[PDB]
Design an enzyme around this catalytic site. Sequence first.
Site, PDB file in Angstrom:
ATOM      1  N   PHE A 212     -28.077 -67.859 -29.127  1.00 11.86           N
ATOM      2  CA  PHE A 212     -26.972 -67.699 -30.069  1.00 11.86           C
ATOM      3  C   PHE A 212     -26.646 -69.049 -30.692  1.00 11.86           C
ATOM      4  O   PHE A 212     -26.563 -70.063 -29.991  1.00 11.86           O
ATOM      5  CB  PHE A 212     -25.749 -67.135 -29.354  1.00 11.86           C
ATOM      6  CG  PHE A 212     -25.010 -66.095 -30.137  1.00 11.86           C
ATOM      7  CD1 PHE A 212     -24.134 -66.459 -31.141  1.00 11.86           C
ATOM      8  CD2 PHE A 212     -25.174 -64.749 -29.850  1.00 11.86           C
ATOM      9  CE1 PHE A 212     -23.440 -65.500 -31.859  1.00 11.86           C
ATOM     10  CE2 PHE A 212     -24.485 -63.786 -30.561  1.00 11.86           C
ATOM     11  CZ  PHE A 212     -23.614 -64.163 -31.570  1.00 11.86           C
TER      12      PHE A 212
ATOM     13  N   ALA B 100     -24.964 -66.590 -24.145  1.00 17.91           N
ATOM     14  CA  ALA B 100     -24.498 -67.324 -22.978  1.00 17.91           C
ATOM     15  C   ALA B 100     -24.137 -66.398 -21.824  1.00 17.91           C
ATOM     16  O   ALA B 100     -24.239 -66.800 -20.660  1.00 17.91           O
ATOM     17  CB  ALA B 100     -23.297 -68.193 -23.350  1.00 17.91           C
ATOM     18  N   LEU B 101     -23.698 -65.169 -22.113  1.00 19.57           N
ATOM     19  CA  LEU B 101     -23.368 -64.254 -21.026  1.00 19.57           C
ATOM     20  C   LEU B 101     -24.615 -63.827 -20.258  1.00 19.57           C
ATOM     21  O   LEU B 101     -24.531 -63.499 -19.070  1.00 19.57           O
ATOM     22  CB  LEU B 101     -22.640 -63.023 -21.557  1.00 19.57           C
ATOM     23  CG  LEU B 101     -21.229 -63.225 -22.111  1.00 19.57           C
ATOM     24  CD1 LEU B 101     -20.669 -61.912 -22.655  1.00 19.57           C
ATOM     25  CD2 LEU B 101     -20.299 -63.797 -21.054  1.00 19.57           C
TER      26      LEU B 101
ATOM     27  N   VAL C 245     -21.323 -71.971 -27.517  1.00 14.24           N
ATOM     28  CA  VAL C 245     -20.345 -70.956 -27.887  1.00 14.24           C
ATOM     29  C   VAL C 245     -19.468 -71.573 -28.970  1.00 14.24           C
ATOM     30  O   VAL C 245     -18.775 -72.571 -28.723  1.00 14.24           O
ATOM     31  CB  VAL C 245     -19.501 -70.519 -26.678  1.00 14.24           C
ATOM     32  CG1 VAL C 245     -18.689 -69.275 -27.012  1.00 14.24           C
ATOM     33  CG2 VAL C 245     -20.384 -70.273 -25.455  1.00 14.24           C
ATOM     34  N   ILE C 246     -19.507 -70.996 -30.171  1.00 18.40           N
ATOM     35  CA  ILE C 246     -18.750 -71.486 -31.321  1.00 18.40           C
ATOM     36  C   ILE C 246     -17.709 -70.436 -31.683  1.00 18.40           C
ATOM     37  O   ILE C 246     -18.044 -69.261 -31.872  1.00 18.40           O
ATOM     38  CB  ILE C 246     -19.665 -71.784 -32.525  1.00 18.40           C
ATOM     39  CG1 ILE C 246     -20.821 -72.688 -32.082  1.00 18.40           C
ATOM     40  CG2 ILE C 246     -18.854 -72.408 -33.681  1.00 18.40           C
ATOM     41  CD1 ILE C 246     -21.713 -73.166 -33.230  1.00 18.40           C
TER      42      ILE C 246
ATOM     43  N   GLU D   1     -13.408 -65.418 -34.822  1.00 17.96           N
ATOM     44  CA  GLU D   1     -12.102 -64.925 -35.239  1.00 17.96           C
ATOM     45  C   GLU D   1     -11.249 -64.379 -34.106  1.00 17.96           C
ATOM     46  O   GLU D   1     -10.062 -64.113 -34.329  1.00 17.96           O
ATOM     47  CB  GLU D   1     -12.280 -63.815 -36.284  1.00 17.96           C
ATOM     48  CG  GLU D   1     -13.112 -64.221 -37.479  1.00 17.96           C
ATOM     49  CD  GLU D   1     -13.243 -63.109 -38.501  1.00 17.96           C
ATOM     50  OE1 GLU D   1     -12.472 -62.119 -38.437  1.00 17.96           O
ATOM     51  OE2 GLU D   1     -14.116 -63.233 -39.386  1.00 17.96           O
TER      52      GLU D   1
ATOM     53  N   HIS E 151     -12.966 -63.398 -28.049  1.00 14.93           N
ATOM     54  CA  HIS E 151     -14.282 -63.383 -27.419  1.00 14.93           C
ATOM     55  C   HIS E 151     -14.778 -64.794 -27.119  1.00 14.93           C
ATOM     56  O   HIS E 151     -15.538 -64.993 -26.161  1.00 14.93           O
ATOM     57  CB  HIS E 151     -15.280 -62.647 -28.313  1.00 14.93           C
ATOM     58  CG  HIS E 151     -16.398 -61.987 -27.564  1.00 14.93           C
ATOM     59  ND1 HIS E 151     -16.218 -60.844 -26.813  1.00 14.93           N
ATOM     60  CD2 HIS E 151     -17.710 -62.305 -27.455  1.00 14.93           C
ATOM     61  CE1 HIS E 151     -17.371 -60.489 -26.273  1.00 14.93           C
ATOM     62  NE2 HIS E 151     -18.293 -61.359 -26.646  1.00 14.93           N
TER      63      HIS E 151
HETATM   64  C1  LIG Z   1     -19.617 -63.616 -30.670  1.00 19.76           C
HETATM   65  C2  LIG Z   1     -20.613 -64.254 -29.734  1.00 19.76           C
HETATM   66  N1  LIG Z   1     -20.638 -65.576 -29.713  1.00 19.76           N
HETATM   67  C3  LIG Z   1     -21.481 -66.189 -28.933  1.00 19.76           C
HETATM   68  C4  LIG Z   1     -21.466 -67.651 -28.946  1.00 19.76           C
HETATM   69  O1  LIG Z   1     -20.713 -68.297 -29.643  1.00 19.76           O
HETATM   70  N2  LIG Z   1     -22.380 -68.202 -28.090  1.00 19.76           N
HETATM   71  C5  LIG Z   1     -23.270 -67.514 -27.261  1.00 19.76           C
HETATM   72  O2  LIG Z   1     -24.032 -68.152 -26.566  1.00 19.76           O
HETATM   73  N3  LIG Z   1     -23.251 -66.160 -27.281  1.00 19.76           N
HETATM   74  C6  LIG Z   1     -22.400 -65.547 -28.073  1.00 19.76           C
HETATM   75  N4  LIG Z   1     -22.360 -64.174 -28.105  1.00 19.76           N
HETATM   76  C7  LIG Z   1     -23.295 -63.405 -27.266  1.00 19.76           C
HETATM   77  C8  LIG Z   1     -22.773 -63.063 -25.865  1.00 19.76           C
HETATM   78  O3  LIG Z   1     -22.809 -64.202 -25.054  1.00 19.76           O
HETATM   79  C9  LIG Z   1     -23.620 -61.928 -25.262  1.00 19.76           C
HETATM   80  O4  LIG Z   1     -24.987 -62.126 -25.523  1.00 19.76           O
HETATM   81  C10 LIG Z   1     -23.181 -60.524 -25.712  1.00 19.76           C
HETATM   82  O5  LIG Z   1     -21.783 -60.355 -25.693  1.00 19.76           O
HETATM   83  C11 LIG Z   1     -23.859 -59.443 -24.888  1.00 19.76           C
HETATM   84  O6  LIG Z   1     -25.253 -59.619 -24.936  1.00 19.76           O
HETATM   85  C12 LIG Z   1     -21.491 -63.528 -28.925  1.00 19.76           C
HETATM   86  C13 LIG Z   1     -21.471 -62.050 -28.942  1.00 19.76           C
HETATM   87 CL   LIG Z   2     -17.937 -60.467 -38.593  1.00 22.52          CL
END
Ligand SMILES: Cc1nc2c(=O)[nH]c(=O)nc-2n(C[C@H](O)[C@H](O)[C@H](O)CO)c1C
Ligand SMILES: [Cl-]
Lengths: 154, 153, 152, 152, 152, 154, 152, 153, 152, 152
Positions: H25, H59-60, H84-85, H88, H91
């Site tokens: 991500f 990241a999850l 993780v950025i 809105e 989350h």
């Molecule tokens: C909105 C969002 N933002 C990030 C982020 O900023 N950084 C990151 O590593 N992952 C993000 N994800 C994905 C989630 O971590 C995860 O992959 C989903 O919620 C379920 O697969 C999501 C869904």
């Molecule tokens: Cl959006």
Amino acid sequence: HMNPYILTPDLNGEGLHIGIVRARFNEEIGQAQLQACLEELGKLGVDERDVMVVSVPGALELGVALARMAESYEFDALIALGAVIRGETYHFEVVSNESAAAISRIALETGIPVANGVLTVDTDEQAQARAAGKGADCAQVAVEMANLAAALEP
Amino acid sequence: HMNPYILTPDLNGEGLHIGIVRARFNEEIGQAQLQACLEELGKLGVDERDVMVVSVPGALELGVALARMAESYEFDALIALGAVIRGETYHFEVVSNESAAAISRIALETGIPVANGVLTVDTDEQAQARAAGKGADCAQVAVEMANLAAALE
Amino acid sequence: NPYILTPDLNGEGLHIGIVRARFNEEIGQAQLQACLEELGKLGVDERDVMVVSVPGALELGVALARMAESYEFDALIALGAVIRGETYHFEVVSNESAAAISRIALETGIPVANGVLTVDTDEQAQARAAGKGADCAQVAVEMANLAAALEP
Amino acid sequence: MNPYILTPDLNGEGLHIGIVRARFNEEIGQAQLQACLEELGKLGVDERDVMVVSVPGALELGVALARMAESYEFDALIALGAVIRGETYHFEVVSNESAAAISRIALETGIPVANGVLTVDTDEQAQARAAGKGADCAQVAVEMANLAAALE
Amino acid sequence: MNPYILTPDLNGEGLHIGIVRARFNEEIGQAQLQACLEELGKLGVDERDVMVVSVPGALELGVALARMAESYEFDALIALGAVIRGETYHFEVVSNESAAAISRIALETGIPVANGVLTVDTDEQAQARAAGKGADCAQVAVEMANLAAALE
Amino acid sequence: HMNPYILTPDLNGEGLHIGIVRARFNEEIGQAQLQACLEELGKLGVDERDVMVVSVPGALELGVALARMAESYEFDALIALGAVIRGETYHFEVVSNESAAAISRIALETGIPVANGVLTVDTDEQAQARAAGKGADCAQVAVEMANLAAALEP
Amino acid sequence: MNPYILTPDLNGEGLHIGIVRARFNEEIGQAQLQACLEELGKLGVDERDVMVVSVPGALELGVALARMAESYEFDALIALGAVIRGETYHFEVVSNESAAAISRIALETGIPVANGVLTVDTDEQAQARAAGKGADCAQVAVEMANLAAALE
Amino acid sequence: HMNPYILTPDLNGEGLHIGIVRARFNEEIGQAQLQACLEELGKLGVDERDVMVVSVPGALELGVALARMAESYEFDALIALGAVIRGETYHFEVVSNESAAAISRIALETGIPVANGVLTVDTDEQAQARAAGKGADCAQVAVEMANLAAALE
Amino acid sequence: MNPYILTPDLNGEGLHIGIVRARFNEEIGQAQLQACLEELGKLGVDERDVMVVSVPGALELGVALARMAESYEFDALIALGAVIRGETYHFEVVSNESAAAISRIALETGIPVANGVLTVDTDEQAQARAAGKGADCAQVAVEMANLAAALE
Amino acid sequence: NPYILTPDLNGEGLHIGIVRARFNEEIGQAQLQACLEELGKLGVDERDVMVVSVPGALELGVALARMAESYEFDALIALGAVIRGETYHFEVVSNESAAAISRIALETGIPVANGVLTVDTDEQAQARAAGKGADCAQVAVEMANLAAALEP
Ligand SMILES: Cc1nc2c(=O)[nH]c(=O)nc-2n(C[C@H](O)[C@H](O)[C@H](O)CO)c1C
Ligand SMILES: [Cl-]
Ligand SMILES: Cc1nc2c(=O)[nH]c(=O)nc-2n(C[C@H](O)[C@H](O)[C@H](O)CO)c1C
Ligand SMILES: Cc1nc2c(=O)[nH]c(=O)nc-2n(C[C@H](O)[C@H](O)[C@H](O)CO)c1C
Ligand SMILES: Cc1nc2c(=O)[nH]c(=O)nc-2n(C[C@H](O)[C@H](O)[C@H](O)CO)c1C
Ligand SMILES: Cc1nc2c(=O)[nH]c(=O)nc-2n(C[C@H](O)[C@H](O)[C@H](O)CO)c1C
Ligand SMILES: Cc1nc2c(=O)[nH]c(=O)nc-2n(C[C@H](O)[C@H](O)[C@H](O)CO)c1C
Ligand SMILES: Cc1nc2c(=O)[nH]c(=O)nc-2n(C[C@H](O)[C@H](O)[C@H](O)CO)c1C
Ligand SMILES: Cc1nc2c(=O)[nH]c(=O)nc-2n(C[C@H](O)[C@H](O)[C@H](O)CO)c1C
Ligand SMILES: Cc1nc2c(=O)[nH]c(=O)nc-2n(C[C@H](O)[C@H](O)[C@H](O)CO)c1C
Ligand SMILES: Cc1nc2c(=O)[nH]c(=O)nc-2n(C[C@H](O)[C@H](O)[C@H](O)CO)c1C
Ligand SMILES: [Cl-]
Ligand SMILES: [Cl-]
Ligand SMILES: [Cl-]
Ligand SMILES: [Cl-]
Ligand SMILES: [Cl-]
Ligand SMILES: [Cl-]
Ligand SMILES: [Cl-]
Ligand SMILES: [Cl-]
Ligand SMILES: [Cl-]
Ligand SMILES: [Cl-]
Ligand SMILES: [Cl-]
Ligand SMILES: [Cl-]
Ligand SMILES: [Cl-]
Ligand SMILES: [Cl-]
Ligand SMILES: [Cl-]
Ligand SMILES: [Cl-]
Ligand SMILES: [Cl-]
Ligand SMILES: [Cl-]
Ligand SMILES: [Cl-]
Ligand SMILES: [Cl-]
Ligand SMILES: [Cl-]
Ligand SMILES: [Cl-]
Ligand SMILES: [Cl-]
Ligand SMILES: [Cl-]
Ligand SMILES: [Cl-]
Ligand SMILES: [Cl-]
Ligand SMILES: [Cl-]
Ligand SMILES: [Cl-]
Ligand SMILES: [Cl-]
Ligand SMILES: [Cl-]
Ligand SMILES: [Cl-]
């Protein structure tokens, strides 16, 4: 029940003269707002020869521009367009608070309605989702408020 | 569709006289802003002898200085420089809010545009990354709003 | 290249008025002590300083207004401290006291140094008291000379 | 340095005091006024020189206080009331606006206005502060009224 | 202990009231207006002496209310509407500014302005307060109109 | 009134073996804490031959180090030193929450007390104001808790 | 409509209670302990069946309480102390972690642990809650000890 | 005054085997971190054939991947990369808090140090300014904690 | 795609349900239980298959629910109560911990636990939700209990 | 230079279980529709997918636990949406539902895609529903193949 006198809103733009001030920061948003604003004004009957458009660098410069235009009293209403988009610092709150306060003050002190079309959002996506709709709403607000101000003026 | 009159912004700084007030708190930041601001003004055609520069201790002291200069009506536009960097307490919000409010009110009540180049950041690193760019931005803002003000006068 | 007005810290002959809020009185007293000491270092005669006190930070505004309106002072100084307690009143007093100080300076042309601390703990106020008092003296002297400089 | 120090003056003899009590959360404002009147009489304020008016809520304070200050029949005014947080942002709105109106009145008319509007999160916080605050506002009004005359 | 206490006067006979209704989240403003009008009539306000205007949003309340207050055809004004939080900081901006304009008009023209603009997070909150706030504004406009007359 | 059995705190460090883990991020703070910590331990009677000191890059690495040391059961108590200082992002909250949670867990699961000397502050000045005092407090906490754990152990 | 309802049992006869008192902001924990002990005796707990330990701070409550719960000499445990906000985020850390440890011990050992650790912003708040929270913890430990026995 | 035993940190990476899990991500950020991380590992003496690299969507999804690798006990230390950025909604807090918690728990329950190189920032610009530096930092963290773990084993 | 879809099952016949009601802000928990028992009987849960226990507060829920879940006499459990914000950070602590204990119990024992603990700012918010929430928890318990058996 | 395990999106032969929370049911349904469509695009047979629903996000944890414990699924997916209302319950449900999803994946080794939105407005959920559902299918297929890759 009680039946008072209710002034019906008037959205006829024919004969109105409208001034617009567009902030260029995050310029693509201002452009989308202005396009939708002009389209709506023409739909309401505002003659294109009766509309002036000016631009300023950012939303903090709106106040000084709008103040001069309202002082001339050549305009039945004004419109402020632009977008404050949050970055990394508290400056987002300062520009949002101050631009709105200036817009609100000008209308109160000169009697010239000023539609506030300045978005104050967290992300570019939120500004894009609101640009076109906000521009058109400002056109409707300027026409309705110009007419209401005339109705309340002897 | 519709096609109204468009005032194209004018950035010709020839013949303008600019006044600048620089707060010295976190002095290095205001210095980098001022160097960028003067350099940009020359790029837009402002004469060296056409610029006055004043400095005040902090951002709260700006308002009184900007007011006195604007009331003289010797300046086509003004610029405020400085930086509020958060410390440990609510004073950061107080100085940020009040300094900006004074700048906006001066431009509204005198008709002299005042470019707000006062940073309001959490860290010294954020202030550093923004100093030079903001100072240049304020020069373009003062020149453009100065021309716009005269056109509407 | 351009004209630069150099800061002038010569306080000789200046007339300075100070308004001290007494809430959390220890802080204001330490500020006033450091402020008077500093003013004398700048050359302000002791006979050219008037000092008045008010109950709290919200009462500062009306006091400074009357003193600035007399135009017997080249600059004023506000001392005091708002220290957070349990409720939103902290924000109210901090916001309003600053706004009044700023407004008086803009409307009368007389500089007003803002020496009112807005902190969360007694310790934060104690750490800043003596400093801020001295800073205000330098601000009032420099801005007082500055104000005369832009006048005829 | 021994500068000219204006000693605070708490002699209430001969002062005219006006009071405006917001009635929202009425128990609070009434406890504030009961303590306020007790204190004013303690300082020497004649019962015949005090007028008391009430308004529905804290936002209505500004218009009432403005009219009484404009009459210039009062040496100082006192605002009583309590904003108690509920479920929404209206708590911040009422707290901010009421304080801003009180401050603006004192700056523009030269009549000190003691600010005794509490801005709290719970009924209990308001009850803990009501009686003390009312007495405090009485002392602020007498001192600031005497103070205003000294600078007039 | 025994001062002059001005008693609130809720007699609406002969009063002329102006109402401005922001139409954003229109159902809320309309419900407010119904309860407001019914309460004004209960208080003795004649329907022939009430004028009602509407505006797009709360930010346009200031310019409309300012014009009505300038004419001095009204003993009191009433502002109705609802700001409901969406996704962005615009909720705070409209809440703050509309309230500040309403407050400013009353202070500078002497015409009381009841502030019935809700500032809530949900539609359900606005609905729960709509009718109660409308009637409260009716009582506020009548009482403050009578109070303003007393101090004239 | 009611008079129960009250265990009196015991601050005698003689014979105790203490392990210290120092995070090096914002290293000057960790150094000041360690200096004050050693001084206090010696004042309490802890033999210097009975104290081991290890360091790790940052506060997020404390948990794995402290976990191994507690597992050996060669230590009567452990001490965590370091400083999380807020920067520009939410990472301040993540490191503060997670380092404390790890420290708290190790003591609960192994029975070995772990003094938490990790500052979580907004400014370098706040960390400096607390470094020396926090180090000494951790020394007193480790000695007192080692003795209390022994008293509750059969 | 008519199910089985287990009635709370506040009889403290024969119960053995362990108490751990964090000494940070010591006056608060000591006031809690006094009210706790007096209430335990009121409930019939014999003083000979109560053990009291103290620790430096709330973060050390976990390791002490864990050891007591492991011995299974106690029908219930009580945690006393006070976290008082200072200048930094450490207030949240100690509030969160101490509560989480107390909760975790009860769930994994079956021994109820009354949580009497305050988490407040001011000294005055801690003082106002100290004695009331201590006695509440006494009633909680007795009732939950009896409930735990019922489900064994 | 007092002078106890001091384990001097050891950064000799010779002979270590490192496992890396990179969330994709905001992929550019994790790529810049990974390039810096591998470059630093070589600088400390980690052999190219001694490193395994895996990637997961977000990241999850890290936690499950880091767990499987650590349980094999083929790695002296592990590294988690990603960013993780904020957008809105809340989350951002959820992913930041949970991803970090999984990393810390894995290192505690398996004894395998896990360097946390997952940025948690408000803007893309903040992530850019920190990517390369953080990736290098994680390489030094994994090598040092890997040596420290063995010394305490 | 028509994958295998397990239809939710709301037949309460034959289910054993355990309920733990926190008594802090007792009016709320009692309204929740009154609605809960009404609903369970509506879905077919026998009165003789329901046991009801109560605890002083939401933090005591975890130990009680843990013991009942460990008995494996219940197909599902229900937690009732209300945390109402007061003056301090303890509101966040109690809200977070109580929910975390309920969740942990359901994961570790396989017994679904409906979470009917409200976490609100005002008494009024708790009163608006209490009866609806109690009924909702009854339907969650029956559905999740039947669901657990299907996957067992 | 080093070993790189390339992502594998071949879903042929995978067995995927999906648990959909029904609160704000419109969102979960749009996610499930987009998720099933995507899974078939990856090659997942319709006969290899089981779909179950639960009332809310807090009930997800116990459901996913039982399904993962059977080891009949290579990966699971959680769908649903927490949408902020008036109170702190939004944070509680968002935090706990995520924590349970993360914990199951760590403890069972079976990847769990987190498709639970945590938003402030209905519109935010609607804008993300269809996307997130498809994203979860890609996450479950990739992580399912990934999990097998690290095993013998
Ligand atoms: C909105 C969002 N933002 C990030 C982020 O900023 N950084 C990151 O590593 N992952 C993000 N994800 C994905 C989630 O971590 C995860 O992959 C989903 O919620 C379920 O697969 C999501 C869904
Ligand atoms: Cl959006
Ligand atoms: C961060 C920032 N953001 C915006 C924005 O989002 N929209 C906008 O119109 N202007 C922004 N500005 C600049 C100020 O509005 C202003 O133009 C400068 O401070 C120059 O006076 C700034 C500095
Ligand atoms: C703490 C502080 N911070 C700043 C800052 O970050 N930026 C700035 O320009 N000025 C600061 N000041 C000074 C105040 O603006 C002001 O000068 C004093 O409060 C009164 O002279 C102060 C006092
Ligand atoms: C709670 C409080 N706190 C402070 C403070 O921290 N600093 C200060 O200077 N004054 C405080 N006050 C007093 C108000 O400024 C004012 O005097 C009262 O509202 C009465 O008018 C009050 C009432
Ligand atoms: C909800 C509310 N709360 C308070 C309060 O806590 N304290 C107070 O003094 N007034 C309150 N009010 C009344 C408003 O100030 C005002 O009367 C209305 O907005 C109508 O004009 C209202 C409406
Ligand atoms: C986002 C928004 N929300 C509300 C609201 O919740 N309630 C309300 O009365 N008005 C709202 N407005 C409208 C502004 O007051 C205003 O009409 C626009 O900015 C156009 O000038 C806007 C723009
Ligand atoms: C911003 C930051 N701040 C600190 C700090 O203040 N104190 C500290 O000890 N560590 C900090 N870190 C790094 C993490 O603790 C950790 O070492 C890295 O994420 C490597 O895993 C980081 C990233
Ligand atoms: C700052 C602080 N505040 C408190 C407090 O307000 N109440 C309390 O009981 N303990 C406090 N502590 C102590 C920690 O719980 C702990 O003792 C230290 O971090 C040493 O391990 C600390 C460190
Ligand atoms: C102040 C408080 N508030 C609540 C509440 O709002 N809801 C609730 O269920 N319980 C509350 N409690 C009780 C605590 O959960 C607990 O019983 C004490 O901390 C003693 O163990 C307390 C102490
Ligand atoms: C208020 C609320 N909101 C949501 C939500 O936004 N999304 C969701 O999935 N579930 C919600 N719930 C239900 C809880 O998850 C749960 O079912 C209840 O607390 C009953 O156990 C509730 C109770
Ligand atoms: Cl205004
Ligand atoms: Cl939208
Ligand atoms: Cl302004
Ligand atoms: Cl001016
Ligand atoms: Cl103007
Ligand atoms: Cl900071
Ligand atoms: Cl930047
Ligand atoms: Cl101002
Ligand atoms: Cl300092
Ligand atoms: Cl003035
Ligand atoms: Cl108090
Ligand atoms: Cl009329
Ligand atoms: Cl105002
Ligand atoms: Cl006006
Ligand atoms: Cl006025
Ligand atoms: Cl209500
Ligand atoms: Cl823990
Ligand atoms: Cl300190
Ligand atoms: Cl015993
Ligand atoms: Cl737990
Ligand atoms: Cl345990
Ligand atoms: Cl368990
Ligand atoms: Cl209390
Ligand atoms: Cl952990
Ligand atoms: Cl594991
Ligand atoms: Cl462990
Ligand atoms: Cl952001
Ligand atoms: Cl950086
Ligand atoms: Cl599990
Ligand atoms: Cl509801
Ligand atoms: Cl986890």
